[model samples]
Target: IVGGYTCGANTVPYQVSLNSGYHFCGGSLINSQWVVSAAHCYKSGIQVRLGEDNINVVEGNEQFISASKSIVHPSYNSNTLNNDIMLIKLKSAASLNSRVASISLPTSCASAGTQCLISGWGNTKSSGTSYPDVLKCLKAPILSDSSCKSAYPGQITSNMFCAGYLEGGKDSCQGDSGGPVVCSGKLQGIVSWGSGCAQKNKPGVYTKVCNYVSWIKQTIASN
Candidate 1:
C-alpha cells in the first residue's frame, strides 16, 4: 500500500496472499476454509498463502492451500467493476494459530469517517507496475457514499464506497486488490478500484462488504 510501512511478522494474521506462482492479490481468511477477495482476482489454479508477511521468503509460519472452488457474485460487472466481491473455498482447512487465523465479519456497516486499517502489498507508484514483497498497512478514513459519489460522479454504486485520502496518499493499489479494509476488527471493506494509486480528489474505492453479509452467509451455508 502506498504511504504505508512494512508490517511485522504475523501482525496481520488474517491477511493472505493470492498466488498463481507469484503474489497477485491479497485476501482475508474469514474461516478455516473460506477466504473473501475481489471477483476480478478470481481464476482457476490459484493458491492461498496464509499468515504471510514477507512474500519473497518462507517464514515457516505460513499455510499454503489450494482453492477448491471460487464463487463470484452473480451480478459482478467487469466493465463497471460493481459487485466485485468473491469467496473461495479452500481445498483443506487451515489450522488456526497465533500466526494464522480468521477474521470476524461485520454485521453492520462501518460509518463514514471511521479510521480503518487497510493492508496489502501494492505497487510503489500509481503510474508504475512494480510490486513489493513486504506486506504493508495504513489507516484511512471511510468516506460517506455521497462524498464518494462526488469524487467520481455517476460511478460509485451502492455496493461500493470510498476510503483513503482524496488529497493523494495512503492507498491500496495494483497487487493489493482483494485486500482488507478492516474497522473495529471486522472485515468492513474489500479493496476494489481507484482512480490512481493516490491522487487528489480521487479516493480508493472499495466493496461495501456490509451490504453483502447476508449473501455471503447464505452462500457459505448452502454450499
Candidate 2:
C-alpha cells in the first residue's frame, strides 16, 4: 500500500495474514472454516493468522490456524491472471469474537465509483521493498471495467476489476494478494494483480467476488 495508512486495531476484522515462514498474502475470513484469497498466493504449508492488526508483534486476540485444504478456481488463468480467487479450508473453524469475525459476502455486484476499503500487510513500495509491521489500508474507488481495460489492455476480464487513483499512488501491493476489498461491509473483491504497485491509469486489479458466490457456497457444501 503506497498511499495507505495503518489500520487501527481490528478496524478490518475479517482481514488475515496468510503465512508459511512469513507473511506472503492477505485473506478474508468468509465463514468459520473458509478463507478467500488469491490463487496466485497459493503455496504449501499455509497458516492463517486471524485478529492480527500487527504482523511483527502479537496483539493478543489472534488465532493461528493451518490450512486443512485449498481450492483454487478451476477457471483461473495463470497467464492472464483471470479468475484469480482461491479458498482455504481451515483445519478447524475460527471462533468469532470482537477481533476475529467473518464478513458477509457481497449482496450484489459492486458499482463503479463505490468507495471501498482494501486492507493488507503487503509491500508499501512499487519499485523496491517496504513491509509494514501494522496492517495497512487505502480508500480506493471501484473503477469501471472499461477504464480498467484501458489500463491493462487485453488483460482485464469480467472476473477482474480495478480500484485506485488513476493519477498514481494508493494501491494494494505485491504481498497483499488475496486481501479483501470491502464495500457495504461485504467482500467485493480480492487483491489480485496490477501493472505495478501504483501507477498512472493502472489501478489495482481485483478478483470479482460477487461473480463467484454460488461457486464458493457449492464448494464449501460439497467439500
Candidate 3:
C-alpha cells in the first residue's frame, strides 16, 4: 500500500548528488525528529525530500526537516557488515498521516518463518540504479532462524534477520540499505547488508528492531 510505503514522522528521502544536484535511493525515519539511513548515503550537501518525489525542491504535503545530527553505528564492520546502521536527527518534527506517518517498531519479531515487505527507491537488480521518484516496494520472505544461521554461519548474528526470494528477483539491491523491512504491518528490521545485490542463498540482512527496542525507546523518549 502507498500509505505503508510512505515515510513516518521526520522521515524523508536520503539523496546523494555528484554534480551539484541529483537524488538517489530511499531512507527511513527513526525518531519523530530524525531520519536513519546507511552511512554511504551521506554526502556534503545532499537534500532530503519528505513526502514527495520531485525532490529538485520540496513538493509534498509533509514538512521538510533538515538534518541536525548524523550518527553511524559505532561498531559497523564493513567486512562482515556487523552494524551497518546510522541515525539522522532532523532539525524539527514532521506531521504524521497516512501519506506521512511514523512507523511503529515491533515489540516482538517473527519467529523464523515470517514474511514481510521491503520497499525503496533503489535498484531492483544488481548493478542497477535507484528507482525514479515514485516509491517502489516489494515483498520478500523471511528465512527460518536455523536456515539463516546455517547460511551465514559466523557472519550472521542474532541482531540480524534474513529476507529475500530464494528463487531470485524482487530482492533488495544497492541503495536500498537503511530502509525498513516491514513484517506483519510493523517495523521489524532495517536493511543492512546483502551480497552483490540479489544472489542465490544470499538474502538481504537487516538489523533486528526488536533487539534494540529498549535503546530505541529510550533514545526517542529522551530526545
> Candidate 1: TM-score?
0.97
The pairs that clash in candidate 1 are none
Ranking by TM-score: 2, 1, 3
Candidate 1: which stretches are off by over 4 Å? none
Q: Per-residue lDDT for 112 in model 3?
A: 67
The global C-alpha lDDT for each of the candidates, from Candidate 1 onward, is 0.90, 0.91, 0.61
lDDT of 2 by residue, 1-223 (tens): 8889988989898999998989999999999999999999989999999999878887698899999999999998888888899999999999998888899998799999999999898889877898888999998999987898889897887888999989997788988888999988899999988888887888999999999999999999988
Identify the superior model by lDDT, candidate 2 or candidate 3: 2
lDDT for 67 (candidate 1): 95
Q: Cα lDDT of model 1 overall?
A: 0.90
lDDT of 1 by residue, 1-223 (tens): 8888777789999999999988999999999989999999988899999978788998788899999999999999988999999999999999998999899999899989999999998786766676777788888999977889999999988899899888787788888899999999999999999787887888899998999999999999987
Q: Which candidate model has the greater lDDT, 1 or 3? A: 1
- Stretches of candidate 2 off by over 4 Å are none
